[PDB]
Amino acid sequence: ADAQKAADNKKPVNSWTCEDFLAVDESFQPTAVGFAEALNNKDKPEDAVLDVQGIATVTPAIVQACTQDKQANFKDKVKGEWDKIKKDM
Template sequence: MTRIFLVAAVALLPISAHADTKKGLAHWTCEDFTGSEDVFKPKLVYWATGAAKAGKPKMTTIDIVETEKIVPIIIETCQKDPKASFFQTLKSEWRKLEKGVEKLERKAL
């Protein structure tokens, strides 16, 4: 059910002509992501994050603050390597951000 909703949500996003909306998420490049309109980039990150964390109940919440932090990081990383996989870049940058948060939490204890 969740996958159907996610697929429908992305299909309905009006993305600029630069992005190939016929590709599945696994086939999107960073160039496809950076070619989308800026207003839709956070929505794409929300959606792709949900897809990346599917089946992991611990991570099912949407953290708007953290997502707003990571969108510019993903844009910058994708601009450096436009042919890289958007999905892999997103997952990699989330792992880095989450590790940084875990370190801060341990220090606070």
């Protein structure tokens, strides 16, 4: 859809900085991390059962972390926050 963020397909989740994560409401920021990872772990929704606890644990990570660095690169924020959650051990 076009009446959001900037435009349909012009600043996508593999082409723009973390400032574009703060354009989205709290209602759909968990969906913003959702789409970038959902499409990364299956091609079609025949294997979609949702990843609720993952999304709900990771929501307060990218939400803050994209305000910590608006100029941070695409996808590296979801990777870096998942690393802070698991890989930090």
